[model samples]
Target: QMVKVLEKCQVTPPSDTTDVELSLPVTFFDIPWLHLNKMQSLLFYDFPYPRTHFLDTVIPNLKASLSLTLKHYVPLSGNLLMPIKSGEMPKFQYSRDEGDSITLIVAESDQDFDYLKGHQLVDSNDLHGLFYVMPRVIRTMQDYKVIPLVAVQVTVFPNRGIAVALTAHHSIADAKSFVMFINAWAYINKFGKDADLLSANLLPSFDRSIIKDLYGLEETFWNEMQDVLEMFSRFGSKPPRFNKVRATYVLSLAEIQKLKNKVLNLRGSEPTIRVTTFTMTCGYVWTCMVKSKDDVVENELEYFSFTADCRGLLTPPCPPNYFGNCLASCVAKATHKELVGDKGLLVAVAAIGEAIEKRLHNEKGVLADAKTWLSESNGIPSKRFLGITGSPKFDSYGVDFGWGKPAKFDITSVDYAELIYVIQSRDFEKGVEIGVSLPKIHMDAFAKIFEEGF
Candidate 1:
């Protein structure tokens, strides 16, 4: 009773695009993310017009801009080619002849637009209508696994506004490149095509040779996931429609600085530990989360994790526009007893700070963890865990599309990844935003701890 599909259609590059057929082998960075959840989000924009206004103008512009946007980012409309025999590595394959198209679903929902986008807690299942399932996956006789790149679903809320939801394979690009493509699409939609497009060239660098896995990390990565079908088979299962409460919280820059200042203050004038906003923020959230779940055994271990962007940290340092996955997953673990103890905040911050320093700033380089990262048995075991992502730089509020910047932004994947994303504030007034999805009772506790943490 919430939503009714208006139309379903396929969108492709403007037909005259120069990219006919192309392919790129999956680098070591891209292979590890194969089983990761899709990058998902919901952007709400207030229209305040009749349904006909959305049907007439908004619908065509989004589709038109999407088609035009695909022309530049060919891989966004391409398919993932996973080798069946393990004799060959997976690849990003694109071909105009293959009819690579993006699926855009148009729907109208009767849900309360204001309530869904506001800070008042809403059930996660209520927002499921805004999510898009992965497109069809086909096995080719050529011993390849073919899966498309992305899908966009735009839903209308009667006279309120529209919600633009997205589901993208994480391997296609990291947050930086992905947001770049999104902003570019919005720019073109707002500024129109041709001269403005020619003036604002946001072309991505697709050169694979730039990524040098000197020690052959790619081989070890492939060996760990040699059972290609086993890894990619997750798609065959049902996509999750979480039945939990979802809410957004803010961590002002000043409050975060207060956290850091307090940490450093406790550590004397000269501190050995790196107490950064990111670390303190994670440490703060980590303690609050573990403390919220007080029923767990005192000795039980609670895990915290996050991802580090490697664009500028790489050896040769990839260009800012270099498109593809360039990130490292960093995790820290602590038992509930100590995490909820008196010096919990200080210790948790130290643990996470050491994690970021040891992994990312190591002399061994970021590639040292490929084996551990891809391990089937000894990998991340977080039965009781909390993850943090949406590195503030991965901000999405800037994409205007001339419909005005998003009135609100939501990263839907947090439900599946069990991560609490911290992105830039919605209005760009500085500070940061945190998105959390939990059971209603847990959420009520989380909201209090997050706010009272001061």
Candidate 2:
């Protein structure tokens, strides 16, 4: 019952020209993970498709499915860029009618499958490693030809195992939105044999100009944006401080739970703190790191940043199902001494709770202005800010688009200016996935701190 796609458009990303080494315009609105070299391509294999919708029917059906979803992947006209290289900083000039379509690449080979060989994934710690591979992998619209948005690649194994890889430009959609769209398409396709379940008619009504007209400047805009600017200003002068002083490590499930329980058991007052266990753990870890880094005071203030979805924070309320990137970064800062002196997890949770409320409270004009700020800042200086984005609500368990859930689902935002830690709720066994770029030497130190407890 897959819907039929009527038409398709091909878009090619502008190449670097002599006049300008144009950088593809990326914003906070774009999924930050996409910019990271680590978050480029994905692999999905070993899922069973219904017999009725085998390759014969499935391949054709995917043509339509692609059309339905391609609108998001296509870069907006006029917003497209021709980047001219200038040293390390590339600049771009906007143009219209540059066309639209993701560049596609396909590698076809015939070789016997070996488990040991397959398990040897490239080193993820390298910023220029696997993550950087994605941008070049799916940059042009015509790329759809060889790697068509959807296809089944037969492999060497006699058992007929197929590997389907989906590489999407991060600017188009975040992991959550992408999964939702895929699930919607799958639901309609899987059950719609006799009935025609048409995919949502995606139209090109989104206009950045309308946003500009609504809000392009204001007094308070400058004030609210100062923190972000300051963060970037300092970072721009040199490499990130965390890369030098702070250590980072990916933790396991048992270790994380033990820390959470330790925090819970230490509570002396009210038990319920409203914040997620992950946030509490982050708060504790950061406080420890800050304390260990410097002896300015036994009680230096510490703050950890996280993102809040602003679509819901708006007064009129953004469309519930509206799929666009609308979010804000929030800082939950406190003194390391206060946190270390606290007897329980409730205090740590309360710190974030109060800070989030104050920041998100009473914001009708601010939300609109923030959108404008993001759009207007095209000419402003680039800054890096780090925050954690939790997608535990994204039912990763159900994202089986004809393939079983991904063997490993990750949203790595390592080494792309600002670091955003994204965690999928389904993979609790993997502990929390924090997407940040720290120097290789410091990673073990960061891991050891978290390993000790909250």
Candidate 3:
């Protein structure tokens, strides 16, 4: 169906500010979906000029320049509705409704700060950058249910730190594309008129039809993904669901370490059965939670799920810097009693690996079967769900726009869940940052369990 729009809005660029930070990363090629049916906003803040002055000058200039090429920049509905061909350039979809597009927020915070240090906030793991100021923005634009593909707030903190926050709708741009956009913005901000902004090179072509040609190849990565499909079917049923859901609190570094230590202790002899610190920690958390709940089932039967990034296995290499959402969540389950009581750490790691490997190899086939199961009468089994969605693929350290990095970087929590783990690499530390969300009552218990398990 064609995407429907309810309203349309546009602001004329102001005249004075020479630098304009538009969502250029969303050029023609990177992710066709965003170009076609998505709303985006580019926020430029913390200017030397006063808010009024900056707005008066910069907004008008951008609007005038951009409006000139409105036909080129905006998507045509007919183009968007057409079936996409693989390897072909992605079609752009434009919305006439103001409510369907993103609203750019350029406010001058009372605080003063440097951009470098301020940007570090992007790494805070609390999602403060994306969530903190969004409520008000969303409230103002409540009439439109348009999902936010990107949220960028540039501000100067009290310490002269320049911070930029970006939160994109998970559906449109992936981590890689987000970074590309940022780099392009920086280039434009610095170079202006003479800027070698290559639109053709900057944007990628989207042709979904190419996928059809590659789908039949014998050695195609999809073959392995098909294997994962069969294995999941063997388990019998639909993807698992949570009886109750909540987004509680984030886990600290010390807690992560404890979980790792615990796994090491459990796997006495098989040290080579190395799992990511995240896997081990999650395993420990799932096991402990099940054990404490007094559920009738023994701890030995506990199993948990986690997601994996299979970008490397795509039939054709996706543009290294091309940004789009391409990932798969795989399930790895083991009873708590069996893992904690009977199987040592080595066995636990092996089990998790086996489950993940099986899913990857069977992904394509499994997903196809999954689609069938959904369509048919039978359903898949329900099990614990946990995913570590954070990745450093986007240059976390490279969000520099003349100033510096942010101080607090975090992902916003949109839903409450029993177990949701976000794994992020520390901006400064050599370790990974695993953020956990759980109930308040279980918070202490979870923390303790995390400490003991690690």
Q: What lDDT tens digits, residue by residue, belong to model 1 across residues 1-454?
A: 4888889999888776557888887988898777654788788888889999899998999898888877788888888887767477888888888887888899999989998888779777777667667755744747787877888889999899889888888878877777878878888888777525435546678887878888688888777765763756666534556767888877777888888877777663455887766777788888888878773224876778777888788877787678889888777777677888876888788778777777788668786654665552235566667787577876489878788889788877777756788778875366777788888877788778778776
Q: Rate residue 62 of model 3 by lDDT.
A: 38
Put the candidates in TM-score order, highest first. 1, 2, 3
**Candidate 1, pairs of clashing residues:** none
Candidate 3 lDDT over 176-271, as tens digits, reads 544455555554444453445356233332333333223232223333334443343244211123222223233455655565565566554544
lDDT of 2 by residue, 127-234 (tens): 121111222222333211111122212221223233333433334445555455555544444443332323432222233322221342333333344455335323
Clash count, predicted structure 1: 0
Work out the TM-score per prediction: 0.93, 0.56, 0.55
Clashing residue pairs in all predictions, respectively, total 0, 27, 111
lDDT for predicted candidate 2 compared with the true structure = 0.39
